[PDB]
């Protein structure tokens, strides 16, 4: 059975919250976050991977204009690696795809997608795999200005996916089931960079609509 609660932050699988700045590269941060969880699970080391490497090199995505996590996972697999933040630092604007002969820090052997809208399946992938990349509707003022509690807003549009985040756990607080979400808007956003989003409330905000994790 999948446990009632799991929080990968307590297991050391999650790196510190980052700020994508003025670049709409959420998909790049969500993607490296899933890869950091898998790298930690396979090797024992926790290390910051490079979102800039993806922003600059995933030709199939739109850099600061948006992109898909699957495309990013495909790229790391085909390119046989992704550099560390240290070898390829984030600058928050698209640049030429640079090649660092010694920057390679992790590889990816593919990825899996969670079936559309299935929160139960998302719960199991989280419990068995680790952190998982997901997309949601983050357009509401109530999301943008969140600060605490379990987030739930009836106006969230599960068909309006416009932001990529990372699910690092799930649980329940004061009787409300939730997903623990790591954002990439800095530590001053939400609750130290995190948000709890209602779980099992009919795919609120489309949380189980475009979920995937890398295979390592």
UniProtKB/Swiss-Prot annotation:
Q: Please give the function described in this protein's UniProt entry.
A: Thiol protease involved in osteoclastic bone resorption and may participate partially in the disorder of bone remodeling. Displays potent endoprotease activity against fibrinogen at acid pH. May play an important role in extracellular matrix degradation. Involved in the release of thyroid hormone thyroxine (T4) by limited proteolysis of TG/thyroglobulin in the thyroid follicle lumen.
Q: Which organism is it from?
A: Homo sapiens
Its GO biological process annotations read: bone resorption; collagen catabolic process; extracellular matrix disassembly; mitophagy; negative regulation of cartilage development; proteolysis; proteolysis involved in protein catabolic process; thyroid hormone generation
User: Which segments cross the bilayer?
Assistant: none
Reaction it catalyzes: Broad proteolytic activity. With small-molecule substrates and inhibitors, the major determinant of specificity is P2, which is preferably Leu, Met > Phe, and not Arg
- Asked if the keyword Oxidoreductase belongs to this entry, the reply reads no
Q: What is this protein called?
A: Cathepsin K
| A Gene Ontology molecular function term of the record | proteoglycan binding
Its predominant location is: other
Please describe the organ and tissue distribution of this protein's expression: Predominantly expressed in osteoclasts (bones). Expressed in thyroid epithelial cells.
* EC code: 3.4.22.38
Query: Which Gene Ontology cellular component annotation is one that this UniProt entry carries?
Result: external side of plasma membrane
Q: Which UniProt keywords apply?
A: Cell membrane, Disease variant, Disulfide bond, Glycoprotein, Hydrolase, Lysosome, Membrane, Protease, Secreted, Signal, Thiol protease, Zymogen
């Amino acid at each position: 059975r999948a446990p009632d609660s799991v929080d990968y932050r307590k297991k050391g699988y999650v790196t510190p919250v980052k700020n994508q700045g003025q670049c709409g590269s959420c998909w790049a941060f969500s993607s490296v976050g899933a890869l950091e969880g898998q790298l930690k699970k396979k090797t024992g080391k926790l290390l910051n991977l490079s979102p800039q490497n993806l922003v600059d090199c995933v030709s199939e995505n739109d850099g600061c204009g948006g992109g898909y996590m699957t495309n990013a996972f495909q790229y790391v697999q085909k390119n046989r690696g992704i550099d560390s933040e240290d070898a390829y630092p984030y600058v928050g604007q698209e640049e030429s795809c640079m090649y660092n002969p010694t920057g390679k820090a992790a590889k990816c052997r593919g990825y899996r997608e969670i079936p559309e809208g299935n929160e139960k399946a998302l719960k199991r992938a989280v419990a068995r795999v680790g952190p998982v990349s997901v997309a949601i509707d983050a357009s509401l003022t109530s999301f943008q200005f969140y600060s605490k509690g379990v987030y739930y807003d009836e106006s969230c549009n599960s068909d309006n996916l416009n932001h990529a985040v990372l699910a690092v756990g799930y649980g329940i607080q004061k009787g409300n089931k939730h997903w623990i979400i790591k954002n990439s808007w800095g530590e001053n956003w939400g609750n130290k960079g995190y948000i709890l989003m209602a779980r099992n409330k009919n795919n609120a905000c489309g949380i189980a609509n475009l979920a995937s994790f890398p295979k390592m």
